Design a protein around this ligand. Structure first.
Ligand SMILES: CCCCCCCCCCCCCCCCCC(=O)OC[C@H](COP(=O)([O-])OCC(O)COP(=O)([O-])OC[C@@H](COC(=O)CCCCCCCCCCCCCCCCC)OC(=O)CCCCCCCCCCCCCCCCC)OC(=O)CCCCCCCCCCCCCCCCC
Ligand SMILES: CCCCCCCCCCCCCCCCCC(=O)O[C@@H](COC(=O)CCCCCCCCCCCCCCC)COP(=O)(O)OCC[N+](C)(C)C
Ligand SMILES: CCCCCCCCCCCCCCCCCC(=O)O[C@@H](COC(=O)CCCCCCCCCCCCCCC)COP(=O)(O)OCC[N+](C)(C)C
Ligand SMILES: CCCCCCCCCCCCCCCCCC(=O)O[C@@H](COC(=O)CCCCCCCCCCCCCCC)COP(=O)(O)OCC[N+](C)(C)C
Ligand SMILES: CCCCCCCCCCCCCCCCCCCC(=O)O[C@H](COC(=O)CCCCCCCCCCCCCC)COP(=O)(O)OCCN
Ligand SMILES: CCCCCCCCCCCCCCCCCCCC(=O)O[C@H](COC(=O)CCCCCCCCCCCCCC)COP(=O)(O)OCCN
Ligand SMILES: CCCCCCCCCCCCCCCCCCCC(=O)O[C@H](COC(=O)CCCCCCCCCCCCCC)COP(=O)(O)OCCN
Ligand SMILES: CCCCCCCCCCCCCCCCCCCC(=O)O[C@H](COC(=O)CCCCCCCCCCCCCC)COP(=O)(O)OCCN
Ligand SMILES: CCCCCCCCCCCCCCCCCCCC(=O)O[C@H](COC(=O)CCCCCCCCCCCCCC)COP(=O)(O)OCCN
Lengths: 77, 187, 120, 97, 111, 205, 58, 438, 127, 82
């Protein structure tokens, strides 16, 4: 029925025993560390987004400043 | 139970339609819909499920009839009679399954047409709360109908009495399956 | 030092330190020629403190040597290929007998093979 | 364990197979067995070579039909032997050949 | 102890009374392990061990809702840029409160 | 469109407008206009007056809930056995506390709604969400951990549903008729009515 | 005030508690496994290391 | 068209008159004959008739049936994949259920009436409730999930159809109607949101696939998920374009979130069918978003990528079903050494897994290129978002392949002659579409 | 011998499995491994992430020192002792078009300013 | 043997909790009589109620639903005590 739970000890002398076990607790990253690393790596992934945002803001600000100077020049003149 | 849960309603619907017995209040039909659906979902016994389904549907039909849609309620009461005939006079599982599908409002059978009449009348009066409640309560009642299908074919072996007196039961099941396409003009 | 090394008796603990030190001499060398003088030097390093009887000093030496052997663990251990951690370990492992093979599979109840919907 | 009856139909261990290596002989794989060397391999290789050359002929016809040279080569090219759509060579100075 | 069930000739019969175990499709079934089965049961029914904690709320919000908020903001910015690019008037999007009715560009119009 | 080459749907010109044309020649309405009492209760100008007008609904609901529970207790007590304790001393706290706490929740809701609308100066979804959030916060003062989140959300969601299906829904579909010609499309040749259908009279119950 | 909140089955507490004893997979043994968290240490230039490795003539 | 509809009606009809021992053979012949009738419908469909290739009506608005680009592709796909389902399923009960389901689904695709579409599509509601909740190998929870989700979404769609029939007077697609109402747009949208598994309404699909039979899973993945795009191109975009353009940032939010979280949820799977089922959910989002752009590229790319999915995911589900028959296990951790033990099964499994990862010689590549091009036409960032997070699919696919590939195993579990006959058509179709015969 | 070498079989599981046991990759041969080496368990060389970060902190200033001088401290006039390659006007005008060209740094040219602004071009497409 | 859900609580304690539902059961006509009478009079009074805003109506319905006690809850917890 079920597979046997008894291990094979034929090759222990050749390749070492299985007594030594892992020290891992099999638990994940802490919530606080995860928040920092998500909110750091995900922006790095979305590097085009920030480039587009920067250039669009630059374009709009230059356009608005041109408009303001145009208003100043067209008011007096 | 079958004859006195369907036949009396027709006279009351006719009296309401002809003698202008309508109220502006929608609380009672809304309460009927929600209470019927929730109590049907929470009821263990099969008779209570079928009894609460009628409360919910008659509340919705009352909301439709107050607004003057007499034709649709007069069709609904007949389609409901035919749909309830098979589940109440339970002799065969398959007939009861089609009847329960028809009561749910399920598309291949005539019960879909009858529920569709009432729902179509609802969107005309344009009361949003009623429509939202109708959708959610219909889902809740559908869970109970699914309980009824589960009990017959998916829980345990089922053995019933061989009461071979299906006078109009076979005709009613035939009418539920067949009648959808001739009556499609109504909706 | 790992837990298994700590649980060991004193005699075996010093033996482990000598064995690990020799293996790490092998790993950090560039050839067999480097090994012999360094092996003799490790020999003398252990022989110098063997006659101490003060337990506290001996504990100090063992702990310091264990820290030194922990720091100088090689990134690349020199392991024979056929053993665990070796390149040829598991390349084509010898396949065992008593394998469950089903002969003429498609001709066992050929017409009626498929999934059925059973109902109550 | 007494070998099953179908073992007679199965083939032996090849010369290239290491004597220690054991594999299940019943498993079928399109690329071949664990060490192959079938009987009649020479004829199969000859047939494969014939198919390769026939397909090469068909591909050669297709490519020659679809090989378009729109710029003249600087010098004589081997394609002139087999394809007639090669433009006449012109050298670096510009003289036609 | 075993016998060949399948017959290519078509003369196949299932020997339910045979002393020898047939080599049917169940011959190759994986033996299975008790603890692996309980691990499978635990992993599927992980909703039993769900607990509402401030850490759980923090994780759910910061990752799921955070990603939704970031995606919505990025999509809104892209829509604004495209409206500036195309020359369209600012479009009346659902949650944007705009005093313009421009929704679908007229194909016939030149923008 | 039903093709893979050009976009589906269509577009309407913003410059071109179509003159409104009446759905029928003579309009007879069976829908009554809002009463003066409804406009009085809906008035949120004075937050105290708005609160005091709309609380009787909440007090009524609390009284029915308390009466239900108190009758469930009364039904159980045995008439045949004489009871040392006084039943009304047992039952009155039930009804009184249910009614009081219901009235308090409704008062917070109405007061916060009116105060936010006055301060904002605009009728918006946000007033209902904030009043509901405050009411749900009062509901979950000392309650365990999921409930500080869930009740503000549910109580805020309720006015959103009320606004969406009680005000926005009717106003969005006023024009649609169902008889004669479609509201957008009058150019199409459909039977045009002299009078609108009256399916029922104005109600009076 | 008796309310639905009192009788709703809120997920405050785990219905199922995992078993305490857990399987740790077998791993090849590293005798000395203490972590080096200091790039600059006295251990690199320790007198023993100098005598064992750097000093002997090759 | 008429021949196709007649054959679709003939298949359930034949079961009533067959001997109950000839049922499998008659069903297979009927399925192949329906496939041939679909080929005839393609032959009689002239591309000169640009709007609709064919329209037939049988006396009422409900009986109006027609084929367009999307409808024709989806109908040919279902008629192609049905015979494989027929051979995989044994028993008169199962044959009856699957034939009725296929008849209803195939009638839904060609329907041009929203109410008739609703009536035919939801007729297969109990049939899946019974199918997924079958006695020994079914789960009642999954059947409840799928049935309730479908009922609520379809009822919302039905309410929107009633409002359209009241206002316009018609609900047929061939009559041009436009609406700007958001309530009706959401009523039509919710069905698409649920049927095409889109977070957070995707929970029904996994439980259904795992606890459905292999033929049932093949149909579900192959064509029932595609019914969403027939509804979108036929019954939502023509009338509800203003609302999709109004809500486009929200639509992108939901679609890209579905893609990302479905990809991450796939990583936590130990069951092979669940892995394939979650891959399907991540794949649906690109289709939904590409169509929602309402551009020539988007519609074509979505229908193409639907065809690619309906050729790749049925193959993976079929291979997993074959492996489960051979091994009685679906846990990846139990299955090891499959490369050595099943070289022929492993080759096809790797081929189809490469197809699911959208490698160039597969139809998924061409389809993805077109869809990404449409997204790039809308905005660059839209395409960039989808392209990057495609790497998550590679991680879980590679982990599954690595776990299955090697190890120690004492069982020869390789496919028989029947199994190879079952997937040969899918492999041939995948190759033919991959070289560009989309 | 490449083929037929002895191997050790990993022991069967005999204790309740952790929830995140999917982090362990075991094919049945004894030395099972984490899904990504270094995620947990023994560290190669017994070196933690802190050690590697400190080593990188030591390296980066020395590695970056050659690059920072030319890119930042130096200027086009003083970077090199010569001007960029001189071309005929027809060739130079075409070559100056390339944003990634090498004639954009010709400070002798009277179009130096425009060429430099061309070199520092747009981050993203405007349309 | 198969993996099974862990059942919180002890068997006898859970059975004792369940046994607190086995109490003298009143007949439902007593509740129904009062509900019918007060409901008839209530429907008569409702036609005279002032028109309320939809928002207030929904909040009142929510409060009533939250405040409603299921008849089984009183059944289990009823004590004939001060
Ligand atoms: C002295 C006499 C004693 C009585 C005093 C009063 C006398 C009557 C006077 C006037 C009576 C007319 C008006 C009363 C209400 C009409 C009901 C009625 O008469 O039916 C007969 C009924 C008995 O009939 P039955 O068939 O024997 O019992 C069926 C049940 O199965 C019974 O079995 P059960 O109790 O074991 O099971 C109860 C079950 C039954 O189900 C129901 O109760 C259905 C009620 C649903 C709402 C009803 C429709 C609401 C529409 C109101 C319309 C007005 C506003 C308009 C706009 C609103 C838009 C919605 O519900 C529950 O399980 C408990 C929950 C209760 C509400 C469920 C909804 C919860 C939503 C909240 C969500 C928040 C949770 C989030 C977090 C969740 C975490 C996951 O008698 C009464 O119950 C009357 C008691 C009066 C107390 C009501 C208190 C408030 C009333 C107004 C508020 C409206 C909300 C309704 C609350 C619940 C009312 C039942
Ligand atoms: C446009 C049509 C669509 C609209 C639908 C509504 C209109 C209905 C039109 C068709 C109505 C058909 C009704 C079919 C009823 C089925 C006949 C029937 O019930 O016969 C019974 C009658 O049972 C009786 O009780 C007999 C007593 C009455 C006999 C008939 C009386 C006839 C009265 C004259 C009616 C003429 C009409 C008068 C003028 C209009 C016999 O069955 P059982 O023996 O009781 O049990 C059957 C057992 N088993 C099937 C399982 C084998
Ligand atoms: C168990 C399996 C065992 C059997 C294995 C079978 C081995 C298969 C052999 C591989 C075939 C490789 C051929 C690839 C070319 C694709 C063939 C093809 O598409 O036919 C073309 C004709 O083109 C050719 O014949 C190509 C010539 C093939 C030989 C050329 C040299 C062979 C080198 C292979 C390099 C091909 C790289 C192409 C990458 C896409 C059809 O022409 P049209 O009429 O224009 O069709 C319309 C185009 N479309 C298909 C997109 C709709
Ligand atoms: C900052 C990133 C900038 C560079 C990005 C390129 C590399 C990114 C990370 C590369 C991970 C791919 C490596 C891999 O496949 O991992 C495992 C495969 O196992 C896994 O599946 C682990 C999953 C890792 C893949 C994804 C993790 C990294 C994601 C990057 C960002 C995370 C979130 C970002 C937004 C989604 C195999 O590694 P080993 O155990 O060392 O095997 C090597 C052979 N030998 C045994 C001899 C040592
Ligand atoms: C309870 C549940 C919620 C609780 C937890 C929520 C916590 C999350 C909050 C932070 C979320 C990320 C930041 C996005 C929102 C920023 C604030 C919104 C306001 C805003 O739109 O500003 C824009 C942000 O830039 C942008 O356009 C977005 C930049 C950030 C997106 C890229 C970073 C992650 C990349 C990962 C991929 C995700 C996106 C894939 C497409 C730039 O202002 P404006 O110039 O646009 O003018 C628009 C006028 N306000
Ligand atoms: C069935 C809908 C119920 C909502 C379900 C949401 C999830 C429930 C969680 C409870 C949270 C409370 C409910 C909040 C939902 C409203 C959305 C917030 C958006 C928002 O804040 O903008 C408001 C308008 O949106 C609005 O308030 C109207 C938007 C309508 C809600 C979204 C409708 C579609 C959602 C359906 C999702 C799938 C259904 C499954 C539940 C402000 O507007 P403003 O005018 O006040 O301007 C401000 C001038 N002061
Ligand atoms: C004006 C009105 C104001 C709003 C008032 C709202 C009041 C509540 C309305 C809720 C209506 C939704 C109805 C669905 C209820 C959830 C399903 C019931 C839960 C349940 O236990 O069902 C079990 C299995 O269901 C399952 O396994 C299904 C899992 C859950 C189904 C997912 C729900 C569908 C998707 C939800 C949103 C879809 C889009 C919404 C626009 C079977 O129970 P049993 O048969 O054994 O009976 C034994 C009785 N305990
Ligand atoms: C919170 C995020 C939103 C979640 C949705 C995500 C994306 C879904 C988009 C689907 C695309 C087409 C759907 C049309 C609109 C649906 C929701 C759009 C967002 C929304 O709620 O906008 C509201 C308007 O829509 C409305 O007033 C109606 C909202 C939908 C009603 C919900 C249930 C309806 C069910 C009806 C059944 C069929 C009935 C047919 C008669 C309020 O926005 P606003 O313009 O007022 O701006 C005020 C802000 N300050
Ligand atoms: C030549 C071109 C450049 C080549 C690559 C250069 C990369 C330089 C980045 C490293 C230099 C700056 C490091 C930040 C200063 C930290 C110094 C102390 C480190 C520390 O205390 O915490 C560490 C954090 O990891 C960290 O320090 C991770 C920060 C790394 C930032 C991401 C940059 C990519 C790095 C990829 C290669 C670098 C490998 C070494 C970092 C170890 O953390 P713990 O595990 O002990 O935490 C405990 C688990 N609860």
């Amino acid at each position: 029925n079920y597979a046997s739970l008894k291990a094979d000890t034929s090759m222990d002398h050749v390749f070492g025993d299985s007594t030594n076990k892992l020290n891992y607790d099999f638990q994940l990253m802490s919530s606080k560390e995860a928040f920092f690393w998500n909110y750091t790596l995900y922006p790095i992934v979305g590097f085009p987004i920030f480039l587009y945002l920067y250039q669009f803001n630059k374009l709009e600000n230059f356009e608005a400043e041109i408009a303001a100077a145009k208003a100043a020049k067209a008011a007096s003149e | 139970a079958f004859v006195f849960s369907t036949l009396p309603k027709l006279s009351v619907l006719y009296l309401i339609s002809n003698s202008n017995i309508g109220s502006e209040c929608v609380w009672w039909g809304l309460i009927s819909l929600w209470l019927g659906s929730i109590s049907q979902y929470q009821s263990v016994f099969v008779r209570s499920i079928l009894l609460y389904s009628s409360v919910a549907e008659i509340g919705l039909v009352l909301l439709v009839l107050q607004e003057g849609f007499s034709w649709e309620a007069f069709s609904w009461v007949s389609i409901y009679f035919l749909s309830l005939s098979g589940v109440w006079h339970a002799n065969s599982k398959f007939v009861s399954a089609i009847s329960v599908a028809s009561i749910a409002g399920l598309p291949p059978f005539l019960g879909f047409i009858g529920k569709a009449q009432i729902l179509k009348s609802l969107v005309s009066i344009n009361l949003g709360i009623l429509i939202f409640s109708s959708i959610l309560a219909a889902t809740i009642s559908f869970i109970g109908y699914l309980r009824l299908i589960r009990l017959m074919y998916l829980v345990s072996p089922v053995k019933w009495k061989n009461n071979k007196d299906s006078s109009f039961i076979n005709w009613s099941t035939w009418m539920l399956t067949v009648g959808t396409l001739p009556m499609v003009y109504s909706v | 030092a790992s837990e298994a090394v700590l649980r060991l008796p004193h005699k075996l603990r010093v033996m482990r330190m000598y064995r690990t030190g020799l293996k790490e001499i092998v790993n950090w060398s560039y050839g067999r020629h480097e090994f012999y003088p360094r092996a003799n030097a490790l020999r003398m390093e252990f022989e110098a403190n063997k006659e101490l009887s003060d337990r506290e000093q001996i504990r100090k030496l063992v702990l310091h040597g264990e820290d030194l052997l922990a720091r100088f663990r090689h990134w690349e251990p020199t392991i024979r290929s056929e053993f665990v951690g070796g390149t040829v370990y598991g390349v084509w492992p010898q396949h065992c007998k008593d394998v469950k093979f089903v002969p003429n599979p498609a001709y066992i109840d050929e017409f009626k093979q498929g999934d059925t919907v059973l109902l109550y | 364990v007494p070998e099953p009856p179908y073992a007679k139909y199965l083939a032996n261990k090849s010369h290239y197979c290491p004597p220690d290596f054991h594999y299940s002989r019943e498993i079928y794989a399109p690329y071949g067995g664990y060490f192959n060397d079938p009987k009649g391999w020479r004829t199969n290789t000859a047939i494969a070579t014939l198919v390769m050359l026939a397909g090469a002929y068909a591909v050669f016809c297709f490519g020659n039909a679809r090989e378009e040279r729109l710029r003249a080569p600087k010098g004589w090219i081997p394609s002139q032997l087999w394809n007639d759509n090669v433009p006449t060579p012109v050298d670096y100075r510009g003289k036609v050949l | 102890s075993s016998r060949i069930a399948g017959d290519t000739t078509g003369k196949y019969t299932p020997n339910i009374f045979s002393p020898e175990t047939p080599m049917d499709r169940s011959f190759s079934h994986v033996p299975k392990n008790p603890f692996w089965e309980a691990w499978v049961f635990r992993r599927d029914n992980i909703q039993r061990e769900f607990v509402w904690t401030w850490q759980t709320i923090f994780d759910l919000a910061t990752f799921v809702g955070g990603l939704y908020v970031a995606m919505y903001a990025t999509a809104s910015f892209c829509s604004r840029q495209n409206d500036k690019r195309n020359g369209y008037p600012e479009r009346n999007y659902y949650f944007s409160d705009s005093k313009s009715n421009f929704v679908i560009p007229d194909e016939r119009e030149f923008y | 469109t039903f093709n893979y080459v050009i976009p589906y749907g269509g577009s309407s010109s913003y410059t071109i407008n179509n003159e409104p044309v009446k759905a029928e020649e003579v309009t007879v309405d069976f829908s009554k206009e809002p009463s003066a009492s409804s406009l009085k209760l809906a008035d949120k100008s004075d937050w105290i007056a708005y609160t005091f007008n709309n609380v009787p609904l909440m007090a009524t609901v609390g009284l029915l809930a308390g009466a239900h529970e108190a009758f469930l207790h009364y039904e159980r007590t045995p008439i045949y056995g004489k009871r040392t304790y006084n039943i009304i001393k047992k039952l009155a706290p039930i009804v009184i506390n249910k009614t009081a706490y219901a009235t308090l929740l409704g008062a917070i809701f109405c007061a916060t709604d009116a105060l936010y609308e006055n301060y904002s100066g605009k009728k918006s979804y946000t007033s209902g969400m904030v009043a509901g959030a405050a009411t749900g916060a009062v509901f979950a003062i000392g309650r365990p951990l999921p409930q500080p989140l869930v009740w503000p959300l549910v109580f805020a969601a309720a006015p959103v549903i009320a606004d969406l299906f009680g005000e926005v829904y009717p106003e969005s579909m006023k024009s649609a008729r169902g008889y004669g010609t479609p509201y957008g499309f009058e150019n199409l040749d459909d039977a045009v009515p002299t009078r609108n259908p009256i399916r029922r009279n104005p109600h009076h119950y | 005030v008796k309310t639905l909140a009192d009788y709703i089955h809120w997920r405050n507490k785990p219905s199922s508690i995992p078993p305490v004893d857990e399987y740790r997979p077998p791993v090849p043994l590293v005798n000395y496994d203490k972590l080096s968290t200091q790039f600059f240490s006295k251990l690199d230039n320790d007198p023993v290391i100098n005598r064992v490795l750097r000093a002997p003539k090759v | 068209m008429s021949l196709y509809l007649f054959m679709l009606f003939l298949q359930p009809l034949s079961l009533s008159f067959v001997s109950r021992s000839f049922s499998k053979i008659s069903s297979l012949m009927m399925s192949f004959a329906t496939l041939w009738s679909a080929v005839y419908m393609w032959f009689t469909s002239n591309g000169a008739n640009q709007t609709f290739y064919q329209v037939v009506s049988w006396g009422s608005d409900w009986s109006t049936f027609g084929v367009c680009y999307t409808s024709l592709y989806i109908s040919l796909l279902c008629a192609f994949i049905f015979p494989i389902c027929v051979i995989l399923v044994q028993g008169y009960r199962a044959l009856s259920i699957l034939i009725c389901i296929q008849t209803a689904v195939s009638l839904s695709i060609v329907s041009l009436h929203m109410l008739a579409f609703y009536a035919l599509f939801e007729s297969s509601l109990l049939l899946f409730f019974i199918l997924i909740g079958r006695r020994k190998y079914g789960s009642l929870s999954a059947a409840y999930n799928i049935s309730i989700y479908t009922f609520i979404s379809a009822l919302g769609f039905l309410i929107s159809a009633f409002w359209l029939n009241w206002s316009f007077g018609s609900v047929c697609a061939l009559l041009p109607n436009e609406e700007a109402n958001s309530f009706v747009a959401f009523g039509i949208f919710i069905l698409l949101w649920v049927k095409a598994p889109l977070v957070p309404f995707h929970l029904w699909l996994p439980e259904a696939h795992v606890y459905a039979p292999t033929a049932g899973s093949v149909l579900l993945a192959g064509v029932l998920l595609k019914i969403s795009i027939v509804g979108l191109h036929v019954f939502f975009l023509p009338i509800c374009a203003s609302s999709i353009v109004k809500a486009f940032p929200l639509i992108l939010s939901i679609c890209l979130g579905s893609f990302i979280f479905s990809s991450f949820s796939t990583l936590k799977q130990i069951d092979l069918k669940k892995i394939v089922a979650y891959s399907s959910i991540s794949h649906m989002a690109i289709v939904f978003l590409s169509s929602a752009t309402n551009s020539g590229l988007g519609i074509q790319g979505a229908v193409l990528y639907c065809i690619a999915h309906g050729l790749i995911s049925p193959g993976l589900f079929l291979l997993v079903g074959i492996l489960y028959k051979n091994t009685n296990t679906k846990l990846v951790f139990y299955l090891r050494g499959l490369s050595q033990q099943a070289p022929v099964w492993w080759s096809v499994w790797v081929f189809f897994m490469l197809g699911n990862l959208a490698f160039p010689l597969f139809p998924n590549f061409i389809a993805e290129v077109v869809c990404l091009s449409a997204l790039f036409k809308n905005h660059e960032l839209y395409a960039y978002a989808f392209i990057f997070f495609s790497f998550v699919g590679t991680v879980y696919s590679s982990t599954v392949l690595g776990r299955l590939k090697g190890g120690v195993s004492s069982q020869c579990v390789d496919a028989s002659r029947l199994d190879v006959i079952s997937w040969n058509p899918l492999v041939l179709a995948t190759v033919v579409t991959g070289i560009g015969y989309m | 011998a490449g083929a037929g070498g002895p191997v050790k079989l990993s022991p069967p599981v005999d204790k309740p499995l952790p929830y995140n046991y999917d982090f362990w990759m075991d094919n049945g041969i004894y030395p099972g491994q984490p899904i990504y080496d270094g995620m947990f368990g023994s560290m190669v060389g017994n070196m933690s992430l802190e050690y590697m970060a400190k080593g990188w902190l030591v390296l980066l200033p020395i590695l970056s020192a050659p690059f920072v001088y030319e890119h930042c401290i130096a200027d086009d006039v003083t970077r090199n002792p010569f001007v960029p390659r001189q071309y005929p006007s027809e060739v130079r005008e075409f070559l100056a078009l390339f944003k990634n060209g090498f004639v954009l740094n010709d400070y002798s040219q009277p179009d130096y300013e425009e060429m430099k602004r061309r070199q520092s071009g747009l981050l993203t497409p405007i349309y | 043997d198969e993996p099974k859900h862990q059942i919180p609580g002890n068997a006898l304690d859970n059975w004792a909790f369940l046994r607190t539902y086995a109490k003298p059961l009143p007949d439902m006509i007593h509740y129904y009589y009062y509900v019918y009478l007060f409901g008839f009079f209530f429907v008569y009074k409702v036609a005279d109620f002032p028109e309320y805003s939809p928002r207030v109506l929904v909040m009142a319905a929510l409060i009533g639903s939250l405040f409603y006690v299921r008849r089984d809850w009183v059944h289990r917890e009823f004590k004939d005590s001060p």
